[PDB]
Amino acid sequence: TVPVALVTGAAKRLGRSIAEGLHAEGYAVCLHYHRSAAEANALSATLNARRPNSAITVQADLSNVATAPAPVTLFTRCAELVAACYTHWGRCDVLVNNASSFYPTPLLRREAMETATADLFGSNAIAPYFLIKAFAHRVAGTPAKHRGTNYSIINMVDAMTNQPLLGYTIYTMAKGALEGLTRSAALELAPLQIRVNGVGPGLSVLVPAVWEGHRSKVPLYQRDSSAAEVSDVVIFLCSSKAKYITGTCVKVDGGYSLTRA
Amino acid sequence: TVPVALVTGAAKRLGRSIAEGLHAEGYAVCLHYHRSAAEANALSATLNARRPNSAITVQADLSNVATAPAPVTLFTRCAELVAACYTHWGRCDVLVNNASSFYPTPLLRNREAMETATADLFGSNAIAPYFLIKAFAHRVAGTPAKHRGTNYSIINMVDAMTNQPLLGYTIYTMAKGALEGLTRSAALELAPLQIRVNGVGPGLSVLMPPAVWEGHRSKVPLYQRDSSAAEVSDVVIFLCSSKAKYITGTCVKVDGGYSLTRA
Amino acid sequence: TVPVALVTGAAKRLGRSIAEGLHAEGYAVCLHYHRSAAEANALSATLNARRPNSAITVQADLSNVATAPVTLFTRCAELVAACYTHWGRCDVLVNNASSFYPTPLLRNREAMETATADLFGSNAIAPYFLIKAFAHRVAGTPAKHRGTNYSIINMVDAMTNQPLLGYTIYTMAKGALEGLTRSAALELAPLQIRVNGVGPGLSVLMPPAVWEGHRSKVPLYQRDSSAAEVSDVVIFLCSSKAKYITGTCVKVDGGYSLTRA
Amino acid sequence: TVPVALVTGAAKRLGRSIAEGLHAEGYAVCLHYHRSAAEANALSATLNARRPNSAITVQADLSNVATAPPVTLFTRCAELVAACYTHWGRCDVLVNNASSFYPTPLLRAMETATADLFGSNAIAPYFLIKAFAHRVAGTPAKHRGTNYSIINMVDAMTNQPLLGYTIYTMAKGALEGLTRSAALELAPLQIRVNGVGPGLSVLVVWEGHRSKVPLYQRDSSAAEVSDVVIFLCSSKAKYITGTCVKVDGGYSLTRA
Numbered sequence A: 001t002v003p004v005a006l007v008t009g010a011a012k013r014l015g016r017s018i019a020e021g022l023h024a025e026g027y028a029v030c031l032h033y034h035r036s037a038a039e040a041n042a043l044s045a046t047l048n049a050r051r052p053n054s055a056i057t058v059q060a061d062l063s064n065v066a067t068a069p070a071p072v073t074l075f076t077r078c079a080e081l082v083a084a085c086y087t088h089w090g091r092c093d094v095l096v097n098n099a100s101s102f103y104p105t106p107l108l109r110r111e112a113m114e115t116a117t118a119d120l121f122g123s124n125a126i127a128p129y130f131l132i133k134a135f136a137h138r139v140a141g142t143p144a145k146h147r148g149t150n151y152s153i154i155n156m157v158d159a160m161t162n163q164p165l166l167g168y169t170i171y172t173m174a175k176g177a178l179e180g181l182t183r184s185a186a187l188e189l190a191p192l193q194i195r196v197n198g199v200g201p202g203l204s205v206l207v208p209a210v211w212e213g214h215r216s217k218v219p220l221y222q223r224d225s226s227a228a229e230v231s232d233v234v235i236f237l238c239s240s241k242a243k244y245i246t247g248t249c250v251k252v253d254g255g256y257s258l259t260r261a
Numbered sequence B: 001t002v003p004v005a006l007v008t009g010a011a012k013r014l015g016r017s018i019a020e021g022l023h024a025e026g027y028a029v030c031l032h033y034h035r036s037a038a039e040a041n042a043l044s045a046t047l048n049a050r051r052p053n054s055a056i057t058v059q060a061d062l063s064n065v066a067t068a069p070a071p072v073t074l075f076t077r078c079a080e081l082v083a084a085c086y087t088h089w090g091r092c093d094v095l096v097n098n099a100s101s102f103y104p105t106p107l108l109r110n111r112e113a114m115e116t117a118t119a120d121l122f123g124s125n126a127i128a129p130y131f132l133i134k135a136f137a138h139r140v141a142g143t144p145a146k147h148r149g150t151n152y153s154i155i156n157m158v159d160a161m162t163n164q165p166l167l168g169y170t171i172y173t174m175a176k177g178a179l180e181g182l183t184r185s186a187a188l189e190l191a192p193l194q195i196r197v198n199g200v201g202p203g204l205s206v207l208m209p210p211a212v213w214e215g216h217r218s219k220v221p222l223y224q225r226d227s228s229a230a231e232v233s234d235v236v237i238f239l240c241s242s243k244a245k246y247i248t249g250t251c252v253k254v255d256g257g258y259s260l261t262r263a
Numbered sequence C: 001t002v003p004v005a006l007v008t009g010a011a012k013r014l015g016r017s018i019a020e021g022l023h024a025e026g027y028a029v030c031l032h033y034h035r036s037a038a039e040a041n042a043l044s045a046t047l048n049a050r051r052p053n054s055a056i057t058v059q060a061d062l063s064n065v066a067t068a069p070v071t072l073f074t075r076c077a078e079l080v081a082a083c084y085t086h087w088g089r090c091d092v093l094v095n096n097a098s099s100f101y102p103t104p105l106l107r108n109r110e111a112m113e114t115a116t117a118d119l120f121g122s123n124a125i126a127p128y129f130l131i132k133a134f135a136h137r138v139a140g141t142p143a144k145h146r147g148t149n150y151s152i153i154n155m156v157d158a159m160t161n162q163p164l165l166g167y168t169i170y171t172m173a174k175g176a177l178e179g180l181t182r183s184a185a186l187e188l189a190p191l192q193i194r195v196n197g198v199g200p201g202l203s204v205l206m207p208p209a210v211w212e213g214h215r216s217k218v219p220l221y222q223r224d225s226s227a228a229e230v231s232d233v234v235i236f237l238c239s240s241k242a243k244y245i246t247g248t249c250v251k252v253d254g255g256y257s258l259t260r261a
Numbered sequence D: 001t002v003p004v005a006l007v008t009g010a011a012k013r014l015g016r017s018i019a020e021g022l023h024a025e026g027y028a029v030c031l032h033y034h035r036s037a038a039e040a041n042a043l044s045a046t047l048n049a050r051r052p053n054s055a056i057t058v059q060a061d062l063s064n065v066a067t068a069p070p071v072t073l074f075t076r077c078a079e080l081v082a083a084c085y086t087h088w089g090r091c092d093v094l095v096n097n098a099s100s101f102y103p104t105p106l107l108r109a110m111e112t113a114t115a116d117l118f119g120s121n122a123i124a125p126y127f128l129i130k131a132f133a134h135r136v137a138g139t140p141a142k143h144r145g146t147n148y149s150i151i152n153m154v155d156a157m158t159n160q161p162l163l164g165y166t167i168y169t170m171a172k173g174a175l176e177g178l179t180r181s182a183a184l185e186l187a188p189l190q191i192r193v194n195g196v197g198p199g200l201s202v203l204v205v206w207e208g209h210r211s212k213v214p215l216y217q218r219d220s221s222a223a224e225v226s227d228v229v230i231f232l233c234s235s236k237a238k239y240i241t242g243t244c245v246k247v248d249g250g251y252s253l254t255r256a
């Protein structure tokens, strides 16, 4: 009776608001983290205090690399994340692919580039593929009679990547791949009634002289969004209200994509 | 202190579902109709029964023509629709441009019914959306900022399947493509008044020989069926809600994945 | 023997350049104009000098207004009639004519009714009616007498997904024209009529700092295009080389659509 | 000198037709291949028989795997661009054609599919683009060519995904993101970056697939695609950048 969400990069910022919002709706929440161990553990205790046995935390590098104990592939670590929900609670109804690295990969003007490829592509595109695969296998290997009634996968994409940010080619490619995954997984998982949608923020919860300048670009309100302005949309899309939506991406950008230089 | 929604073509189908959903969230609803008087009036009696003074009905042909006098323009009729909300309740917070003509206009056939077809399919789908949006905008801009609503939201009912056009339906496909540009253009220009403008684009909703109903339905990837009206209108209500307040300029497909298909 | 093109708003700027490039490729050209009868008579003369009986001129208002009543749809069949009249054919239609002026929502009834018919007539309604006229003509040519390369190009706008503030009527009419392209492409494919769009950004563009400011924002070259930068694309899409391309819109915009405020 | 084009996967089919097309236009062509040595070398022979010194061949696995001396994909790709500069001193045009294509079903190792499908389609194209841009950047303004053009071969139909081809579809989506981001970033150096998206092309159970095509009810010939790649590289398309041109006979307009 209590559904389970797995939220990647759940420790802070938008991933934390997504986990908080799903939890508010009655979900048990698997809080994935990579480096933010203290934040993830504090968030868990907050939600477990509000509602016993309502949250767990699991650590994984979603980079496209191996990790030592066979060195452990990204694939294995992805199946293991999904397995953690099944092991704790016997289900996993919602997957939010939120975790994402983001930093410049300039084409113009070290082995960091292999590091960058692995990290940006892994977190943003390849781990989402492997997570959705493990998610879908687990639904597929549940007898029909016992399947949940509202399986939902949300990919966090980017409303502004048709208007790329100068110098972020690999990240922009990765988001594009992610949008690809949304359409391909919606089509292919439809027979198991698993919906696959994207949410794309424009500017959200910006870190002062420059904050002010970015803020002023947004037609609506001339500010970046709050975390909850994004997560409320994620929450709606996972709801039974949205049960006819799949294969689609929703921009939550204040009209930022409508602007031109 | 009760919010007001104007829903066009509210009498039946999707427009009635949207009207009932907004009503359920505590909107007073102004139900526009053209031909469907009996249905609209019964819808409004149901709503007023549930909550006094929470609905009215207004008639207007949104076809881009002049109507019965010196002659009345579509503009005027549109502005009068908005002014009906303001006359009765003193506000208009939401507008759902739902009303819409749909019928083939094939490029290859071979006369007054060519001129009234463009007027009807273009008016209902695009130009009346424009004028109602401009009349709606005018009212807000008119209100001292101290008396303005805090959640203004315009929704335009577009078509998920317009990039994959239905054979023979060119004017209709065009007018929907128009409606998408108004959605984007209005979102931009009305952002300073915090008027959000978005689209909702159904695929197959509330759909012939029945093996051809069963035939069309089966092509949708999710559930192999057309949607319920609620499956569409819940999305409309979400975009109107204060939880959607950073959303503007976007269209949301509700198509069960239909737009993902190829022949 | 010599293929015919019909080009609307052919008298100046981009439409003149399209008429020339088709003229240069050896089309006989029907130069449509509305107000600029001089410039058109001028151009006709020039190309009728390079080559006898290779250019004609034709006047019509493509606004959605009945004239002295003659409805828009008959003036459009008239235009198409005039190529078959003179030359016995019409192989190419370019819907280039377009009025363009602000129709703002805020700030500041005679005006408004005239803008609706002018902006939607010219950008959208007449193109519809012209295509209809053109398709019926081909349909009513026995197959064995049809030309081998029918091509319609609609001049759309690269930048309409990023609307120009205060231009809604225009932006809507361009989105109808996009609709027209895909819809006609699909419908006319059996006739082997190809229908495509070409979408300029800033082309052949207040205080000089303003002009420069606008030009400065184009990523590639930091300027507006020339007529020929656009007309070359049009002529390619009409060439037998593009014979597998229908239903598609080609941006010619120097990257401008890739920018954000 | 004559301008030079690098075409990846140039041995057969579209990639050969492109090579041929640019050659017939006056380009000297670097013909990249992976497994099709014999075909690549026959092409080059025909090409050099036509105009001496106008074709060469280079082999490279564009899968994202560290190869044997270990040699990474970055290195392989940079070297590929250096082969142009080494033999002809210039590289004017890059066509990212090379592409692996096979199912990666979500419902029925993965390691190799991922490195191969994302490398050929997405990660190699980026390193190739970056190598190209670095070689242009480092050329003194005075001696830079006057018509830099990069063509990504994308897919017109990827918004309408082929069931079971998730990784391929993702990789062509990455390649679309590369087209735009590289077009923006390399615009100041006057390198245009564009995509061409085939529908069904040169289908190798077939009349079923091609009858879905609105225009002519067939798949395209190889020329009906390469001619488009040729035009976009030409100076007549010098204002077109960031753009993808579908060449699909209208197939992307269909629905089930």
Ligand SMILES: NC(=O)C1=CN([C@@H]2O[C@H](COP(=O)(O)OP(=O)(O)OC[C@H]3O[C@@H](n4cnc5c(N)ncnc54)[C@H](OP(=O)(O)O)[C@@H]3O)[C@@H](O)[C@H]2O)C=CC1
Binding pocket: A008, A009, A010, A011, A012, A013, A014, A015, A032, A033, A034, A035, A036, A037, A060, A061, A062, A063, A097, A098, A099, A100, A101, A102, A119, A122, A123, A156, A157, A158, A159, A200, A201, A202, A203, A204, A205
């Ligand atoms: N903020 C904005 O304005 C925008 C956001 N978005 C998208 O929304 C999503 C959420 O945004 P935001 O909150 O700003 O994200 P953040 O950049 O703050 O990061 C989210 C989390 O991702 C995790 N992560 C990063 N790299 C890896 C990796 N290699 N392996 C595993 N986990 C990793 C980190 O977890 P940990 O801290 O535990 O290491 C991090 O806290 C992202 O997908 C982003 O692309 C899109 C548009 C703009």
Ligand SMILES: NC(=O)C1=CN([C@@H]2O[C@H](COP(=O)(O)OP(=O)(O)OC[C@H]3O[C@@H](n4cnc5c(N)ncnc54)[C@H](OP(=O)(O)O)[C@@H]3O)[C@@H](O)[C@H]2O)C=CC1
Binding pocket: B008, B009, B010, B011, B012, B013, B014, B015, B032, B033, B034, B035, B036, B037, B060, B061, B062, B063, B097, B098, B099, B100, B101, B102, B120, B123, B124, B157, B158, B159, B160, B201, B202, B203, B204, B205, B206, B207
């Ligand atoms: N149903 C579907 O599968 C899809 C629907 N949509 C869109 O969703 C919306 C609602 O769809 P649906 O419920 O099927 O729409 P309907 O065709 O059922 O029409 C809704 C109402 O539009 C009104 N209307 C039509 N023309 C005019 C006009 N000239 N002037 C005034 N009102 C007019 C009618 O009111 P009356 O009866 O009072 O005369 C009608 O009941 C539309 O905008 C539609 O295009 C999009 C794609 C798919």
Ligand SMILES: NC(=O)C1=CN([C@@H]2O[C@H](COP(=O)(O)OP(=O)(O)OC[C@H]3O[C@@H](n4cnc5c(N)ncnc54)[C@H](OP(=O)(O)O)[C@@H]3O)[C@@H](O)[C@H]2O)C=CC1
Binding pocket: C008, C009, C010, C011, C012, C013, C014, C015, C032, C033, C034, C035, C036, C037, C060, C061, C062, C063, C095, C096, C097, C098, C099, C100, C118, C121, C122, C155, C156, C157, C158, C199, C200, C201, C202, C203, C204, C205
């Ligand atoms: N130039 C640019 O930057 C851009 C251009 N485009 C599109 O490219 C095309 C050409 O651009 P450009 O040359 O600058 O356009 P212009 O503004 O120069 O106009 C083209 C011609 O359209 C004709 N026209 C205008 N209104 C009417 C009408 N009501 N009835 C009949 N003919 C009419 C005029 O003919 P006459 O003079 O004979 O009256 C005019 O010369 C247009 O479709 C435009 O929308 C798109 C984006 C930007």
Ligand SMILES: NC(=O)C1=CN([C@@H]2O[C@H](COP(=O)(O)OP(=O)(O)OC[C@H]3O[C@@H](n4cnc5c(N)ncnc54)[C@H](OP(=O)(O)O)[C@@H]3O)[C@@H](O)[C@H]2O)C=CC1
Binding pocket: D008, D009, D010, D011, D012, D013, D014, D015, D032, D033, D034, D035, D036, D037, D060, D061, D062, D063, D096, D097, D098, D099, D100, D101, D116, D119, D120, D153, D154, D155, D156, D197, D198, D199, D200, D201, D202, D203
């Ligand atoms: N043909 C079609 O209908 C469609 C094609 N396209 C796109 O058009 C382009 C050309 O299509 P098409 O000619 O059919 O392509 P092919 O499937 O024939 O592949 C082209 C070449 O790619 C090379 N290649 C494949 N994998 C690798 C790799 N791991 N490393 C290096 N080279 C590799 C091969 O080289 P070698 O043979 O030497 O090993 C191959 O011959 C592709 O990018 C494709 O996605 C788009 C959609 C439809």
Ligand SMILES: COC(=O)C1CCN(C(=O)c2ccc(N(CCCO)Cc3cnc4nc(N)nc(N)c4n3)cc2)CC1
Binding pocket: A099, A100, A101, A102, A158, A160, A165, A202, A203, A204, A206, A207, A208, A210, A211
């Ligand atoms: C504000 O920081 C500063 O003061 C300066 C330091 C350098 N700097 C940036 O690194 C930067 C940071 C965030 C930016 N964001 C605007 C959205 C662009 O997509 C915020 C954003 C944040 N974190 C993010 N994390 C993921 N995984 N993905 C995303 N998109 C993301 N985005 C843009 C540029 C801007 C100026």
Ligand SMILES: COC(=O)C1CCN(C(=O)c2ccc(N(CCCO)Cc3cnc4nc(N)nc(N)c4n3)cc2)CC1
Binding pocket: B099, B100, B101, B102, B159, B161, B166, B203, B204, B205, B207, B208
């Ligand atoms: C009297 O009708 C007949 O003779 C039949 C044969 C022809 N015929 C159609 O052409 C037809 C009807 C409805 C169709 N719908 C599919 C959605 C297309 O967008 C359902 C749909 C319904 N009503 C609709 N009303 C608006 N205002 N807009 C929409 N899109 C709409 N759509 C499609 C084709 C079915 C009915």
Ligand SMILES: COC(=O)C1CCN(C(=O)c2ccc(N(CCCO)Cc3cnc4nc(N)nc(N)c4n3)cc2)CC1
Binding pocket: C097, C098, C099, C100, C157, C159, C164, C201, C202, C203, C205, C206, C207, C210
């Ligand atoms: C101080 O600031 C100013 O000077 C303002 C004065 C008013 N103003 C303009 O008049 C104006 C004029 C032409 C503009 N063009 C390109 C912008 C479109 O994104 C040039 C263009 C020309 N003529 C055109 N004619 C058709 N039929 N269609 C097209 N698209 C068209 N376009 C832009 C703005 C904007 C700014």
Ligand SMILES: COC(=O)C1CCN(C(=O)c2ccc(N(CCCO)Cc3cnc4nc(N)nc(N)c4n3)cc2)CC1
Binding pocket: D098, D099, D100, D101, D102, D155, D157, D162, D199, D200, D201, D203, D205
């Ligand atoms: C009778 O059953 C069989 O033998 C089937 C075996 C599996 N099978 C396919 O794998 C297949 C092959 C070619 C297909 N093409 C239509 C375009 C799909 O996007 C042609 C295409 C060709 N080669 C290609 N190579 C790259 N690198 N990329 C592309 N897209 C590509 N496409 C589609 C499916 C269908 C035939």
